[PDB]
Design a protein around this ligand. Structure first.
Ligand SMILES: *CC(=O)[C@H](CCCCN)NS(=O)(=O)c1ccc(C)cc1
Length: 263
């Protein structure tokens, strides 16, 4: 696939120390066409349920569209293409042959733009999946890491080394979204990246991509994005079919954050 040359291949050195969470991310298609990004999250029962967090706006929040999903695992460039060079902006060599299809909707909520699906098939050992931890604490972070499929192309990593802030969708005063500032010549996010996770420096999911003004040519504060907060989604719409709590903490531990689980 093709995406902006400013993006960074997950196999590059920027992926060092994050080789676990990279494996939680997948790209997917909706009714046949490539649509967005999602990723696996762990839960307090440590049972490896196929809980796949994505964005509401991608439209998989219905029985009939969730059934239609095709997930592509390990879709990434084989070699590190130097960011900000023509090679990065070129067609990648990623394989889309490790797939699974079908899922059911656990919950969905427009305000924080999240959707929790459960994939029909159990983890295939051949895929070497990872179920990421999460953090629902009401706080900001000194930086963040994005792992996504820009333009639903080869998997990329974007680093933020600026503190996050709370905003409403659109950047106005609010607390439903986390505002993330990208590096001036670093990777960003693009259409297709929606529903991709944003992780704290400690590698726990804090939210998923709603959208924002960024592109590789964006400058200043326009080189940022907004993520619907796990904190918001936790209580969500007020019931199991619109929140994350029931699903992520079935064992009722009351945990504010949890680590990931390997295959
Ligand atoms: C849904 C997704 O692909 C994009 C991500 C864009 C990231 C750009 N830096 N979200 S969106 O913000 O394009 C968007 C599209 C439709 C709707 C209704 C909401 C937002």
């Amino acid at each position: 696939g093709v995406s902006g040359s400013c993006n960074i291949d997950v196999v590059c050195p920027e992926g060092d120390g994050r080789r676990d969470i990279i494996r939680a991310v997948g790209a997917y298609s909706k009714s046949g066409t490539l649509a967005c990004t999602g990723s696996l999250v762990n839960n307090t029962a440590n049972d490896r349920k196929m809980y796949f967090l994505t964005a509401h706006h991608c439209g998989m929040g219905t029985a009939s569209t969730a059934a239609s999903i095709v997930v592509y695992w390990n879709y990434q460039n084989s070699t590190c293409r130097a960011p900000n060079t023509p090679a990065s902006g070129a067609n990648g060599d990623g394989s889309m042959s490790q797939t699974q299809s079908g899922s059911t909707v656990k919950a969905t909520y427009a305000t924080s733009d999240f959707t929790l699906l459960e994939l029909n098939n159990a983890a295939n050992p051949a895929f070497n999946l990872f179920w990421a931890g999460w953090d629902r604490r009401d706080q900001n972070y000194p930086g963040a890491i994005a792992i996504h499929h820009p333009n639903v192309a080869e998997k990329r990593i974007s680093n933020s080394t600026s503190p996050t802030s709370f905003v409403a969708w659109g950047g106005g005063a609010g607390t439903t979204h986390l505002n993330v500032q990208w590096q001036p010549s670093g990777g960003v996010t693009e259409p297709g990246s929606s529903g991709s996770p944003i992780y704290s420096p400690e590698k726990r999911v804090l939210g998923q991509l709603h959208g924002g003004p960024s592109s590789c040519s964006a400058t200043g504060t326009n080189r940022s994005d907004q993520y619907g907060r796990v904190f918001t989604s936790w209580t969500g719409g007020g019931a199991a079919a619109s929140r994350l709590s029931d699903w992520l903490d079935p064992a009722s531990t009351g945990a504010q954050f949890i680590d990931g689980l390997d295959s």
